[model samples]
Target chain A: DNNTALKKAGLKVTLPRLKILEVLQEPDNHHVSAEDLYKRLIDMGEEIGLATVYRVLNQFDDAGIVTRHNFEGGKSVFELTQQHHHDHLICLDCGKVIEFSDDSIEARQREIAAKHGIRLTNHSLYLYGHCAEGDCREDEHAHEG
Target chain B: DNNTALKKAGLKVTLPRLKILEVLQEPDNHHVSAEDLYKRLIDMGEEIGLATVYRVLNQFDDAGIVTRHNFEGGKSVFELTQQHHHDHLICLDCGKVIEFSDDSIEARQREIAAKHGIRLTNHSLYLYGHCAEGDCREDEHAHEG
Candidate 1:
């Protein structure tokens, strides 16, 4: 449970917060939106409004407990903060998202950041293009499974 | 003038549209927000409201004439599309922004996108960090002066 983590983040533990937190940590929800999480919560017999869902998620984001990726060709999605991070490559023509992290790219980022006297804390790299025929374009612009 | 470019983009050459378009083309007006542009227009004796500024920017964004970057800890900013691209490094502690383009990073990005079978069209990379005292931190978190 993220119960202790929430407290350490100086946020009060509420039912909605806990529910949303747990939903975020679930294996099925790598990336989720507030509206989708609200529906998911309701499906699980939890009485929560979209506003509450939005509020809790926003709080988590502000508290630095969650990270938000405003991906191209799709609505923004939230994921729990983790030490391990990966960049994204999205297909603009077909709305497909693929994850990748290259050590060479990471090395360049560190070099560039340090050259400017910056101690890098976080980073986002998004690549947009058209995918090959065998990829998500074949699914006709499907966002995510 | 950008009148020709606007028409080529299939957008009418309205005064507000041209005004905003010209503002973007100005050498001094890189990475700007609607509010700043609104005030800039007002400074130049143009009667434009924030809404109009915002609406024009949204139109330019949709027409692919401008790109919007939602940088961390700062409101989104718009820039004209160019053949060359540069990524950003921002300071979270002091609200500083620096720009750089590394061929190494670009080459790695191309390799990764190609490996993922994505015919890359556009990409954005933002690195967040804390800058040295000599940078913008001394200015007390001043955002773009």
Candidate 2:
């Protein structure tokens, strides 16, 4: 799916770019920064230059293939933009991200923007909360059942 | 007042450090990165080293003398922590920050955290809202008045 989207966006089908996109397309919900992406590449027994990582991601960002968040936690994380817009609820302890969207809340933002007479181009919302008990680590097998 | 507070926090009173504090104290609704601070220093002919700026900022952060925000943009901005905790209602057009605390909302966060059985250490709540008409490019003097 992402490959088709990338092709539509006029990106060349390069191996390094494909591998980078594959790692980002992992089913688990998480936001990885450029540094995190490079680390993940190394963990997968592959070596990619950090500069290439940054350059390729920047290209993807330009192509609208992904959305980048400048989190208040010091790293810029990237996520695929094909899904509907949603805000993030991040776990400070486990470094996990949970996505949620409420129609009423989204509507309220538009109302607030209208009242201010300024056109809303884009917005980012992050709700920081502590890690839920029993969810402190990623090793839990709760989903297996 | 900030200078006095810094000395009371066991920090030596130096020009560069004081200027950094002064920048942070620049009206409540402002954000500045280390690069921004360094440029401001150079503009004022202070000529402080970038490493010194980083070191001093880290020290201040450790002392809890200032709050560092890794905002939705790919940069870290510093602000002084007031006596009370509040969320920011940022003006995306003008880059102004407005602060407000909602007791009901705060209570909701505590309840959510309690449900998970995790003691909340700290939290960052930011509400991005539009600037009132004709209020984007300049400071909101009407509110101050």
Candidate 3:
């Protein structure tokens, strides 16, 4: 499957590429940084170098196989390119990422772009907040008291 | 004026801090990177180190005198914190940044956050596209042939 995808993207089918694609394809691993992915590969006993991982990710980005995001607190994250575009809700305190889409927001962005006389293409929207889940809420409660 | 603002922010009123703030206060110099600001200071014959510029910018960020945006393309841009909130429209081809604000988009974001049960504190929205202005248009026309 990966060889098919890689060949379609004009990338060579190799062990590192396959392993990286396999990690990215995991359902729960939607967003990962190069360091995160590299560490995961090491943990799984894969012998890929960090530089190779970075290069492969960049190539994937160039070939439209992944979308790279530069979120707050430095570093970038990559996600598998998907059909529907969405925005992110980041928990500032916990660094948790939640994705969602809104039609009205999309429509408003088009209107704003029209007003500016620039053709609308792509957008990145990130909302930073504290999540009401788990230790973040507990930490906030502890701070208030 | 710089001293008053710096003292209020609990930062020492040093020359580098004042010079950096002066660059930020220029009428046409919003959304600048540290390297850009550093180069500008040098162009103006101001005696400031790049490290000091970076350090002062971080201090200013910590004190809320400036807001740092981690837009796409590795580098972060800093802007003086203004009374009104705004979003960005970036020319993907030319690296131009235009700012805008829409009340409806703000309301919709609030609704989206509420639906997810997270309290929305802050947000960053960047629209990336090719500008119809000048060289970008010429470049696009050339590509068409």
Candidate 4:
């Protein structure tokens, strides 16, 4: 399935790409950063380098097989582009990312863009702070984040 | 006003700081970038360098004298922190930025953050695209931006 999906996406089935695809295919793999993928690949006993992981991920984004987003922390998070659209809420302390979609927000985004004469194409809305869950500390570098 | 504001912000009234403050104090400067300030200073016959502009802006931000935003392009856009909270709509082609604030969107963002257990300290919502204005062309670097 991974190999066929790669071919369907116009990406030739290379070994590294296939393994990366397998990792991303997992249900919990959305919103993963490049380093996250690399770490996971290493834990899975793959021989792929981090540089190759980044390159393959970029190619996946370019091929529209994945979508990339930079959250409030400025780390690029990649998700499957085929999923229904949503935005992110990030925990500054724990570095957790939660996804949500709101019709009201999406509608306002479009209206605001239209009022400004921009023909809207894409949008990113990231809400950030420390988690209310106890044990999560505030990110002191939040201003920089 | 610039010198007084700098003092109030706990920044000493150095000439470069004062000049950068003067540039940012203008009504139309709400969405200026560090480079924009540098270019304006050069045009105004000031002897400030880009690095100084960046440093002053960072100091200003740290003092809560200004707020910094990275729109879809990942370029820092600075505005007065004292102004009412708002978000941005960016033109991909002409590099124009328009600001807007929507109560509904704000309310929805708060709800989403709460749902995710985040204590919502700050947020950024940026919409990007080409302008409907005919003369504006697509930004070839928009994807990278």
Candidate 5:
């Protein structure tokens, strides 16, 4: 099945590619930086170079197999693209990411783009703040104290 | 006037800090990176270090005097925080940035955040695409041809 997906994207069904896809498939591992992914590969005893991991990820992004997010921090995070569209809610304190989508927001974006005569290509929306209740708030109070 | 604002933010009234603020005050220079600001300063015969530019910009960000946007590109661009909120339209080809504000989009964002139980902190919205009927489009066709 993994090979079929890769073949569909015109990517070779190599060992590293398969392994990377497997890792990405794991739950709660959707949002990971290339450095984090490379480390994960190493932890799994996979003989994959960081450069190869980056190259593969770039290829995946170009092929629309993955979506890259540039959040508040300088690093870019990669996630497998889903059929549905979603925006992000980031916990500024603890680096938690929550994804949600609303039809009204999408419609408003399209309307705004049309007003500006923009062809409405792609967009990224990131909401940054602390979570309702968690160590995220505790850490902020600790820092303040 | 500049010094008063700097003092309110608790930043030292240094020449470099004042110059950086002055550069930001120029029209059409709102969205700029540290490297771009430093180069602009040098072109104006102002002696400043890149490190100082970064440091002051960080301080400005902390003081809410500036807002830093992490767009599609890796670098962070800084703009003075205005009294009102706006979103960005970035030219993927020529690196041009356009700012716009729509009340409908803002209201919908708040509604989405409320439904998710998020406290609704600050947000960044960036629409990335090639500009219409300009060098941005011409350049793309040239590349394709």
Candidate 6:
């Protein structure tokens, strides 16, 4: 199905694109930047230049194969668009990503946007939290999650 | 008094920084990026370079002279720290910034962080709003003053 989608978008079925698709299709927690993708590709024995990665990723974004988010500063992170519609809860300590959704919050955002006759095209909600680091919160109950 | 705070932060009172501070001290928006500061400097006939703006802003951030915010998907903006804490209600259309404080929201953030067992080093809370241009909301109703 996705292969056909790529073909329809006029992107060639190159090995680099194929490998990148596979990497992005993995389960959640892969909130990664272009730099992160380059490092991951090298780790997986895939020889691809960072420039190529950026170019391919931009094409993927144009093709609706992926979505780019500016969650942190100017660094853009990519994720597969077919995944569940959820926002991020990033761990500031280890850069761990947790996906979540709250209908009430989403509704509140819509209400706020509508009050000014402005339409909400898209939105990103990321909450930065610190994960369980050693000897930080020993007295407090460790979050089982 | 504020000048003493700037000197103690180890920042030289240069003409550009002084003018930048005067512009920011105006009872207007709290969230301003380097680009906005650059434009304001050019408007005032100052020959301040954008690189200097970035460097000075970063220094201010490091010295705790101002708080930086990474709103939705835009460039980072800064606000002078205040004695009382508050969050921003940014106007998406007009780029107006309004500060509001709510204990209930603060408590909820703490609860969410504790639920994830993440130690909250610090957090940014921004609620995007759409403020109508021309019909300025009085300073009495907003914190722009």
Question: Model 6 in CAPRI terms: which quality?
Answer: incorrect
The pairs that clash in candidate 4 are: none
| Worst window of 10 by summed lDDT in candidate 5 chain A | A136-145
Q: Per-residue lDDT for A1-145 in model 5, tens only?
A: 9989998888989998999998888755677788889998999999899999999999999988998886757778888995467788766665556677878778877766555445568998988765555565545332121
lDDT of each: 0.76, 0.67, 0.77, 0.78, 0.77, 0.68
- The residue pairs in collision within model 3 are none
**Pick by DockQ: 1 or 5, better one:** 1
Q: List model 4 lDDT by residue over A20-130, tens digit each.
A: 877887766767889989988999999999999999999998888998877744788888887778887888776767777788777777777777667789887878877
Clashing pairs in 2: A72-B70
DockQ, Cα level, model 5: 0.23
Candidate 4 chain A vs. true chain A: TM-score? 0.71
TM-scores for the candidates: 0.57, 0.55, 0.58, 0.67, 0.57, 0.58
Q: Which runs in model 4 stand beyond 4 Å of their true positions?
A: A8-20, A33-64, A67-77, A136-145, B8-10, B14-23, B33-78, B136-145
Q: Write the per-residue lDDT of candidate 1 for residues B28-80, one digit (tens) a residue.
A: 56667778788789999898889989998999888889988767545778888
Report the CA-based lDDT of candidate 1 relative to the real structure. 0.76
Give me the TM-scores of chain B across the candidates: 0.73, 0.60, 0.72, 0.70, 0.73, 0.64
lDDT of 3 by residue, B11-100 (tens): 988888888889888855677888889989999998888998898899899999998876657778899995368788765664546678
In candidate 1, stretches whose alpha carbon ends up further than 4 angstroms from where it belongs are A1-83, A90-98, A114-117, A128-145, B10-19, B38-59, B62-64, B93-98, B116-118, B134-145
Which candidate tops TM-score? 4
- Model 5 alpha-carbon miss at residue B17, Å: 5.1
Better of 3 and 6 by DockQ: 3
Reported per model, the fraction of native interface contacts reproduced equals 0.72, 0.25, 0.59, 0.73, 0.48, 0.30
Of the two candidates 2 and 6, the one with more favorable DockQ, higher being better, is: 6
